[PDB]
Design a protein around this motif. Structure first.
Motif, mmCIF file in Angstrom:
data_model
loop_
_atom_site.group_PDB
_atom_site.id
_atom_site.type_symbol
_atom_site.label_atom_id
_atom_site.label_comp_id
_atom_site.label_asym_id
_atom_site.label_seq_id
_atom_site.Cartn_x
_atom_site.Cartn_y
_atom_site.Cartn_z
ATOM 1 N N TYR A 30 -6.580 2.442 -20.636
ATOM 2 C CA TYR A 30 -5.468 3.273 -20.568
ATOM 3 C C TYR A 30 -5.711 4.463 -21.362
ATOM 4 C CZ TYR A 30 -3.027 -0.618 -18.398
ATOM 5 O OH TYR A 30 -2.795 -1.823 -17.428
ATOM 6 N N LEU A 58 1.712 6.848 -7.406
ATOM 7 C CA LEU A 58 0.805 7.691 -7.739
ATOM 8 C C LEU A 58 1.086 9.021 -7.459
ATOM 9 C CD1 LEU A 58 -2.599 5.451 -6.745
ATOM 10 C CD2 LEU A 58 -1.478 5.749 -8.858
ATOM 11 N N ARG A 108 1.012 -1.182 0.088
ATOM 12 C CA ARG A 108 0.045 -0.132 -0.076
ATOM 13 C C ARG A 108 0.758 1.247 -0.074
ATOM 14 N NH1 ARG A 108 -5.102 1.318 0.741
ATOM 15 N NH2 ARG A 108 -5.586 3.319 1.788
ATOM 16 N N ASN A 161 -4.179 9.894 -6.238
ATOM 17 C CA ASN A 161 -3.571 9.834 -4.976
ATOM 18 C C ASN A 161 -4.475 10.034 -3.818
ATOM 19 O OD1 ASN A 161 -1.626 9.123 -2.852
ATOM 20 N ND2 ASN A 161 -0.972 11.369 -2.770
ATOM 21 N N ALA A 201 -7.439 7.144 -3.829
ATOM 22 C CA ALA A 201 -6.888 6.119 -3.350
ATOM 23 C C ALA A 201 -6.329 5.634 -1.806
ATOM 24 C CB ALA A 201 -5.364 5.678 -4.307
ATOM 25 N N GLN A 202 -6.576 6.974 -1.002
ATOM 26 C CA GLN A 202 -6.328 6.642 0.273
ATOM 27 C C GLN A 202 -7.494 6.374 1.081
ATOM 28 O OE1 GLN A 202 -4.800 10.842 0.782
ATOM 29 N NE2 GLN A 202 -2.736 10.169 1.150
ATOM 30 N N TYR A 203 -8.759 6.448 0.396
ATOM 31 C CA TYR A 203 -9.936 6.079 1.075
ATOM 32 C C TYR A 203 -10.776 4.866 0.405
ATOM 33 C CZ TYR A 203 -9.409 10.737 2.964
ATOM 34 O OH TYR A 203 -8.960 11.949 3.610
ATOM 35 N N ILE A 238 -7.897 7.120 -11.458
ATOM 36 C CA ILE A 238 -7.145 6.688 -10.368
ATOM 37 C C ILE A 238 -5.967 7.979 -10.059
ATOM 38 C CG2 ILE A 238 -7.645 4.398 -10.703
ATOM 39 C CD1 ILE A 238 -5.359 3.791 -11.349
ATOM 40 N N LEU A 266 1.036 4.485 -3.321
ATOM 41 C CA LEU A 266 0.649 5.484 -3.101
ATOM 42 C C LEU A 266 1.841 6.461 -3.415
ATOM 43 C CD1 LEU A 266 -0.996 5.513 0.406
ATOM 44 C CD2 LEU A 266 -1.958 5.837 -1.809
#
Lengths: 98, 48
Positions: B27, A53, A46, B13, B16-18, B11, A50
């Motif tokens: 693509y 990204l 994980r 940052n 993607a944290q939640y 997608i 991050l």
């Protein structure tokens, strides 16, 4: 020659005389990108995702492509450097007389 | 109110944290759309 599209594009763009081109002007047929093969059920997955990204948002990936994956041949341009007329090319004229 | 999202959803940052995404099924990137110009033509008489 059938191979992966991330290498054949680079070889064609770094070839003198522009004597090698890719079919379809950069066409792919099974789109699967690269990746890091972490050990299964690891705890770092994980945090690595991050980080990758984050590089896209800051624009730090395009600079790396410009530094390493830049070519000089303009194979994208389709202007053929002249041509020579042959029998197959000049075939309609004779069959007009036919 | 929903259990899954089936739509074009880029997608990044922040998202993607939640929530958790999957492998992309398309693509692509970002580009700019502008209106084309009139091709026009200049050929009326042989005195040109």
């Amino acid at each position: 020659f059938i191979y992966d599209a991330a290498v054949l594009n680079y070889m064609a763009g770094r070839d003198e005389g522009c004597k090698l081109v890719t079919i379809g002007s950069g066409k792919v047929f099974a789109s699967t990108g690269y990746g890091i093969a972490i050990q299964k059920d690891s705890g770092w997955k994980r945090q690595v995702d991050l980080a990758i990204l984050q590089l896209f948002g800051d624009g730090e990936m395009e600079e790396l492509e410009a530094l390493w994956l830049t070519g000089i041949c303009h194979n994208e341009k389709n202007e053929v450097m002249s041509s020579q007329l042959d029998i197959d090319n000049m075939a309609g004229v004779f069959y007009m007389l036919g | 109110q929903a259990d899954m999202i089936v739509a074009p959803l880029t997608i990044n940052n922040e998202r993607a944290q939640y929530i958790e995404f999957s492998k992309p099924f398309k693509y692509q990137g970002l580009t700019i759309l502008v209106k084309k110009e009139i091709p026009r033509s200049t050929l009326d008489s042989f005195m040109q």
